Symmetry: C4
Subunit: 302 residues, 4 copies
């Protein structure tokens, strides 16, 4: 049968409470971004022109996470954005590249970047793998490759030198892939499939897209991810790369338009709190402890 089964998304499930000995404040949110880079919190700001530039990356790094500077600009600009983050405190920083963009990656590495995010709409392709091999042979850096949803995809990327795999075809807030192409796999299932491969190799999984609430972070992690990438939640915050605008009562941020969210610190604080509480309910002091102990129930939309 062509039907491989029932795909489950964030809103379809709820995590089941376990016996607990840990207070939410006692929980350790420390995780691995790649096999050689680690973070204090499992949050990553998306590589979109509407979410992560130098300001956003500085904020994320100071709060224990990491920003990925988007590639939608010239090489010199992206290297500059990376330098600005490194200048103010010597923080953790990442940057995205497309296919065949070897020189871009090279200059980003020399700028001091900690991770290169090899992004594409369909990560399980020839050209993505060729770029991966080419990067690994020409420069010394940890590479995150995406996006994928299947077992074979995850296996082939790890074998070709991937230091982390990014999961997500479909869930993005500004979606078109599900409608234009009719292609995708729901996030919970997508993480589950990819985790069964990656954890045998000890390779971290980044859950990318579809996060609406702090609860979704807990589900994505509990299901097998090591970190979570967020876009829309951070889009519209003061630190996002836009300018403020006024329409009636409400303040907006143009580039494209989304509602102003205020300081990012308040937004990140709530996400962290929600995750701490989640891991409290499930009696897990660490994310690795969460993987071993977590379970969920299917829920009707209602």
């Amino acid at each position: 049968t062509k039907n491989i089964g029932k795909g489950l998304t964030f809103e379809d499930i709820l995590l089941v409470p376990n016996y607990s000995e840990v207070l939410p404040r006692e929980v350790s949110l420390e995780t691995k971004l790649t096999k050689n880079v680690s973070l204090k919190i499992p949050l990553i700001s998306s590589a979109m022109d509407t979410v992560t530039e130098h300001l956003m990356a500085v904020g994320m790094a100071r709060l224990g996470g990491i920003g990925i500077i988007h590639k939608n600009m010239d090489m010199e600009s992206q290297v500059n954005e990376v330098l600005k983050v490194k200048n103010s405190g010597g923080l953790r920083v990442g940057a995205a590249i497309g296919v065949n963009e070897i020189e871009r990656a090279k200059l980003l590495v020399e700028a001091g970047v900690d991770v290169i995010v090899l992004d594409s709409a369909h990560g399980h392709s020839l050209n993505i793998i060729r770029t991966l091999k080419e990067i690994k042979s020409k420069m010394n850096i940890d590479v995150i490759v995406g996006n994928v949803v299947t077992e074979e995809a995850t296996k082939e990327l790890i074998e070709n030198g991937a230091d982390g795999i990014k999961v997500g075809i479909g869930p993005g807030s500004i979606c078109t892939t599900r409608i234009v192409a009719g292609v995708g796999v729901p996030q919970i299932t997508a993480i589950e499939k990819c985790s069964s491969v990656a954890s045998k190799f000890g390779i971290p999984i980044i859950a990318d897209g579809g996060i609406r609430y702090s609860g979704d972070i807990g589900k994505a992690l509990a299901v097998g991810a090591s970190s979570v990438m967020i876009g829309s939640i951070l889009a519209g915050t003061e630190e996002s790369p836009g300018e403020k605008e006024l329409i009636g009562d409400t303040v907006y941020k143009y580039y494209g338009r989304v509602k102003y969210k205020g300081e990012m610190e308040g937004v990140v604080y709530q996400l962290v709190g929600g995750l701490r509480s989640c891991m409290g309910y499930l009696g897990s002091a660490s994310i690795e402890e969460l993987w071993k102990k977590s379970s969920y129930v299917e829920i009707t939309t209602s």
Copy 2:
């Protein structure tokens, strides 16, 4: 797999009628709150600062149920509220306590409380059990423990001296636990799993949160619960705490979760808002009780014990 099954809530379910010889009026609503405390009607008012204080507890007790005084006040104030209910006839009351609140527990027991509700967002925890053991070893008192959703939780609480188990993580109009933490089990499935353990030991199940209509009470009880704890339905009534406010045409009263920003003044796990004034709570409780009697008429059950014996339900689509 991590998928343990499909969870069902109140709205996903409909009770199947049985052969009936009992009119709604003939129905006995007698039930057990704890191992040693009994109720005339299986209704409890939630331990919340917008639902239950002394007026609510008197109203509940006179109608055959029980009010449980919230813990969002000082010990001296909570004792006084218990003493004010005991001031008018032989009325039964409960009182809520948090983790490691042994002094509050001692004072309420000595204030002549009938039950103590050891209340937690996550009832299956080390802190709860140790607080349970303390009170059970040192005080003569029935203790309801919550909140839980698993069979492992209920068994462990019962073995450590729980006289009643309160079930509910996720349901409740003001609850946002499942949004902010992604945690919960739908209420019917929750009761079902917990009831399978609790009935073996003869320990009553309190179904807490998620009741929107009188038909939900019947569903909770039919599936294995002994009583139902309600908050939102009694929130707007005259007997609930907080003053009344008229905005426009209709009068409003404030309803607030305990894990809400206002109530805490920990990540917020409850919403806050105004709800319409609902008149006297006895008019409200009458409707709920009537619906339960009607429900048990359909299933042909003269008692809740009988209800448990001949209950069945169907799943429904959206």
Copy 3:
């Protein structure tokens, strides 16, 4: 657990087309209302304060169906309503009674009523069964008994003398039993359950409530029912009880303890024509020349929420 399965409503299913030799215009719609009262179309108007009196029962009867006069009136008044129909061309007519209403039934049978409809919210009662038995012992008439949703309930009523079984607890457009009592069985599942008993004894099933479109009639009949009782579909019509009024260039009349207002639906014939037409089309798709063929040939697919 206590989960007896998944309950399907009209909106949950679609009928699968079969090989067809019959055009919609050629199919027969003749059915049995009771054990020994038959209709030319499988439509019945609800016994409600707001849908069926003498005018409605006449219109229904002249179209091949039948009207059940509601009980919410004097025995004298209800007998008179039956009288106005019978003398309007020997038309078939039914009348509703409640529990213990033996005398009302007696006078209605004398008035020459064709069917008595023993109405209860819960037909599987001691009081319903003894009312049925007391009617049969004292008078000679076909009795439809309802409402029920289970196979055990259907059997007991048939054993006690029920000539028709009315099915429907929960699905009625104006019903709140699902909300007040939390009780019910979705209409398709309910008809399926009761048919597995009643078809063996040759006792017709009346599908009652939930019919919102003509396509629902087909589903109800296809799944085992002999006829459908329809309420809100016929509520705003000219022939229904109530007066016309204008509220902002729109004509209205009431539908039901107050229970909201409905728009004027015009002449009842046009409404019935569409319903009958839709059912003919359905039976074309399923290649069924008769309702008996429909039962033998029917299959349906479950449909997702979207």
Copy 4:
């Protein structure tokens, strides 16, 4: 729990295509497909046989882009012939024509006009009248015959045996369709294509997925699951090449769109179609390129260089609403 329940029916919105390893860019994808046993197309798109989507201008544009148009039968015989001939005058272009039950005179004239496919169109294709018409045509005329509409294995098997060169699937879908409401009849489209393809692929008879296409993604879903081509009406209604009149209401330009079994369409049985205005979609060529791009993107995700590759490699997941 049955007993007349045969399973859960899946529609376009119920499933998602699972990506595979890809070596193919969207630009390098072959969209060439089989229309009937003997006729083939360069893009797998057909314009519906409706009096509000396809006449000569629509058919010309469709063929000019690698697809085909089916001239609707809601006109007299000589009018339909003239439409077929008007397509023939603007280059050696392929064109189809719709036909109703027992309309043999119509079929002979349409074949004379140089029609490439006869579409024996019916609401219920699995009937005794349709099979009789199929047998009469295939014995009396040299022409490829697409027969619809059907949803079952038995239906498609019987039509193939009686000389159907193509099977058209779809009872239930269609933006303007109310068969589900009026009759309570239908099968969700994914399930319908699956059931019919399982038979038709054994005989190499192309399946036409008819109705229910709202987005370019649906085309991929229909093809991936077993269809050879996709018939569309809704998304072509209101284009510059559609036979309707252009009309300004407020700030937006509108054109009319109606089902063939609607009240207005039957004027010039009970209605099984709704009618309404649709926003002017502009040039048709532009609308098709978006569909083709999304289709290419889809096959790029599944790493399929041709539709034959797509059938062999495609798989999907069920999703909740």
